[model samples]
Target: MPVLENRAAQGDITAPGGARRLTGDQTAALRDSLSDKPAKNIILLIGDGMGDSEITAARNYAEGAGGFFKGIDALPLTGQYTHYALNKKTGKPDYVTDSAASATAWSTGVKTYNGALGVDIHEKDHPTILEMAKAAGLATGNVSTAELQDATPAALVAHVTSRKCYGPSATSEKCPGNALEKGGKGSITEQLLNARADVTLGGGAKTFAETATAGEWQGKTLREQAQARGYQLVSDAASLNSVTEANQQKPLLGLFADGNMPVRWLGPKATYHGNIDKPAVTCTPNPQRNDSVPTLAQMTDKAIELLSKNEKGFFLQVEGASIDKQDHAANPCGQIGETVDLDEAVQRALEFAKKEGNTLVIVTADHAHASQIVAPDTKAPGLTQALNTKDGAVMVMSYGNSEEDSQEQTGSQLRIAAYGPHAANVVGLTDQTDLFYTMKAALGLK
Candidate 1:
């Protein structure tokens, strides 16, 4: 009922309400944000380990505190969701969640151990949303900045007890039960090929070079097997852009990096009491990230271009994965740049969803990370970094969770926002598993 407006400027900030940023009222826009129709296409964007803190830090660094991300912050309906994994041995709640379990929560609507992929806590394999989408005749895709064999993307297509079982050798050594020689799914890369999404794009080309241990494709490299199986294999921006069509006959597979793709920006590292000891720094482009590596937005655009052609519609997931990776490494600028990069991809998705009334676009994170915004002068117990924001203010970020990224701690709530049909489902307090059903029901699939 009362007026709620932040100080801003139109002509200037000298006149009354001249600095107001609000566009009078948002009643009509709020009404327009509500939707209840079934979605023909669904695009789910994930910022791995991008908790509220991570989002806020990126906003402050890249867009200023008062500014908002056009992609991530534009969703009309937003809410918090809980994400916790189960202890592998006790089945008790392990408040901290690894990417594997967290992704499995949404991908399969089932919780599992910290390192489990596409499986329940009981070690039973579960069909992921992508798999189910394909089963129901919808085009499906999985894309990420991390390795395709990484926890987030791998969960969508591979069912393995250990996330470490990426190639044939890893499966043979780490998860022999899931190995092909023992009469089971080969490896993550092997099952990824078997899962056969209409489009699979990301890094991790090194694993594909491994030869199949057994089965019809035995002794053949996964790369060779991919060609043998009719995949439109692409390894660079030009090749990826050349792909004009994707389907069962010739699914697109883009591997741009040998492992996780290089990050975008590099800057000051978090050090103990560094906020006060070090001078504020600006982000610089990462030298290792060359033009050969396609940006996340480029991959998202290509994926949508191909997947949207299916009349039955499509289900896609695009992840800016390194936000978590950088957060764990105590690199403030690294995480912030990744968040911004993901925002670009999100913008592309929102563009498509807005034009197509039948599309549903949900943006959320897999789990919370350890980054927090602290006072500019405050000395943190763990690591801290001071950055010069666009607003010219010094923003200090702290990461005190732990020195070892392996040390799992109790995770926190995550930000989930959505647009288009069934978007409202994300606007209330929900568990991670609920997201699986949300996208499923939106597409009228099981």
Candidate 2:
């Protein structure tokens, strides 16, 4: 009966007009019970490129003796879904959906073709759920461990046509307190301010603000604009805790470092390079190091603190933005590390739920990457593994493609499993467009 009810519960958990228990971990735990009305708060956590393989890798990385979520196991019950995008017959771009379009699906409840954000395939106007949440008088916010202005986080608010608008000539190679252009003409920092996202956090300090380069773009500091709008702006983990210490109930925007945040394997030294290597592992202590960035957990804490105070409730989006970037670069440690970072954010939401039952928390991935975890035997000292199998046997030679070799390595393949509201609908080969509705369905805001 328990097992059957559990399956029944998974089916019933996401049904409209809520108030049902489907699993042991997700059994409703709150005061006042389930209600007929929509949820008052929403925390949408995106595991960018976090299909099952990513999750498996993260689990392995965190596990000590026994398999545990030690490093990122804090996430409550987990689920998964498939990732498939259509490529035009022209074959210019393959079937894989980029982060931009995938983000639009989660934010707008509709799938536009790749390279578009919160707009139709023809690149038309569309309102994202964040805008809708704001229209409804809810406090809206976005967070990411990657550049705060990156696609997954940006799609929560920004509406654009080309995902690659950042341009090929784009270079963030500038010192901190220097300015660079994201699109070569207009500054993404300026665009980030235009959105007025209540709380925003991530990297890209050099590109958005004054860094090594000068005269690249001119715009108000995103932190300053957010503060001018009465948002409490913070730059690092310590400040985040200090600002929230008094808990004044104001909007918050945080940018912890000059560029991309640190990955999990980063030690103390690698973390202090500032805007130089946004993607590399850093080893540095917080506050003492110039580029000592806050972990994903710090950002999640501050975001929840600020959003929860909204009298009209709030809509918050926290993204582990680097998973996709690492996947594309084929960095296994980082791909899994970012997912672990995402799970940390998920745990924060679960904790928030304990305090406010009305907060709807939905965890999912934008897409799956080609990274597979193989066994140690196949993944020799020089090789990589992409698949995970029990009774541990090494079959696959490696997990990702080397820059020198763009060929797809073959051995074992991993796929996504459904989690959240409409796992089945989006998983196992589906359209990126279907994601928007899934987001809407899970949060019940629209």
Candidate 3:
């Protein structure tokens, strides 16, 4: 319409004439960003709580999408592999392998206990592959549906004492907090000092910014940390567009919310506008207010575009972390849907890979929670009441527990049973540590 002063003023314009002027070096920087492009751009996609059953369900859902994953399936080259962890049988020494341990296996190519991140089982801190890649002049990024500090994303950059230290929801306890502490006081977020990822995005805003809640508070939020280090900060999808459009050369730190973002199923109702009764401090609207929260697919697209602006290419780790939470709650169908969400993310990576050409998009799970789903036939027909489990445990087949129950919840819904790229060893195990190595191998670190 009328001439706009800046892109930010006109909403998120994909290619707006109203833009920020670039300095000469900034122009040179853009040209140089892709000069000595690396032969490989590795994007490790993590479906945190998925296993064989999860994959089976996800693949089935995609297959039903008809011509889905059609692009990757069409690729002439593809490979599949098995996954297992050391001492996973008897019982997880740490019960369920915490996200930190699972992520550490992938990040450092080493095995650690459930609560460790970027640290050995013996608490020996180590540099992650992403950090190493950055040191080698390649750009690095970490994205997760969970908070940016959550174990899966944090593994790409931070190391800490107990993964839980990051928070009940954080992936890197290496930073600070007492959730996972054993008489210790420190966090892995500080370790980011050496890693310096070029881009970091996701929820858990409390961990990165000064907020009223979020426990005892700390030295600097992740955003302040990144900003202090010369990275640009953006708080929403619109801000992301404006910042990138303005100067893609600067590193970026984006925090979308306080914790795991609301899943796509929640839609705009969960995001746009206030909850009315919900306090302004606690209310979180979708970063993109067009009756939408950014889908994992959309976030991944922005991440790849921004991170790839570097000349040496980039190493990005994207996590569909909610899959694990759904599984742990035994919401099989919802968990399956999360797997599908992950599959969608994989499809996005595949699309980018076709363009980037040399990008290695490895998809897998950190660990599979005990997410078991019997087919619809296995149930006697009854929407509510309750149902018997495979193990003869009688319980409500509700969609989710009190913590994550759904208004549209129902029992025994139609869902895909997990299959290939499956986790045979972890399928029925009560403990979840069995899942770590499969993801490690998926990253080609095993």
Q: Considering summed lDDT, which 10 consecutive residues are worst modelled in model 3? A: 1-10
True-structure Cα RMSD, model 3: 15.0
RMSD of each: 3.0, 9.7, 15.0
When 2 and 3 are scored with lDDT, the better candidate is 2
lDDT of 2 by residue, 1-446 (tens): 00111221123323663333233444543112333345677777777777666666566554321244422333233334434333433334344677776777667766567666556655555888877777767777788877765777767665555544331123243211112433322224544555666677777655544321233222444444445546566776777777642122465567766667766643321111211223323222233324456677767887788776668877778788777766665555556657767767777776766567566565667766666555433423332433232214212323334434332322122232222223334334444445556545555655
Question: Model 1 off-target regions past 4 Å?
Answer: 1-21, 405-410
Candidate number of the best TM-score: 1
- Kindly report the root-mean-square deviation of model 1 from the true structure over all alpha carbons: 3.0
TM-score of 1: 0.95
Model 1 Cα shift for residue 355 (angstroms): 0.7
Ranking, TM-score, top scorer first = 1, 2, 3
Preferred candidate (TM-score higher): 1 or 3: 1
What TM-score does structure 2 among the candidates reach? 0.69
Best by lDDT: 1
Question: Stretches of candidate 2 above 4 Å error?
Answer: 1-37, 64-66, 70-80, 86-94, 166-188, 210-232, 244-251, 267-292, 379-397, 400-435, 438-446
Candidate 1, 1-446: lDDT as tens digits: 11111222343445786555565677776677777878999999999988888888998788776676888887777899999899989999998888999999999898899999988877799999999999999999999999999999999999999999999999999988899999988799999999999999999999999999899999999999999999999999988888889999999999999999999998877888998888888999999888888999999999999998999999999999998888888898889999999999999998887778788888999888778888887966898888999889899988887867532233888789888888888887999999999998999996
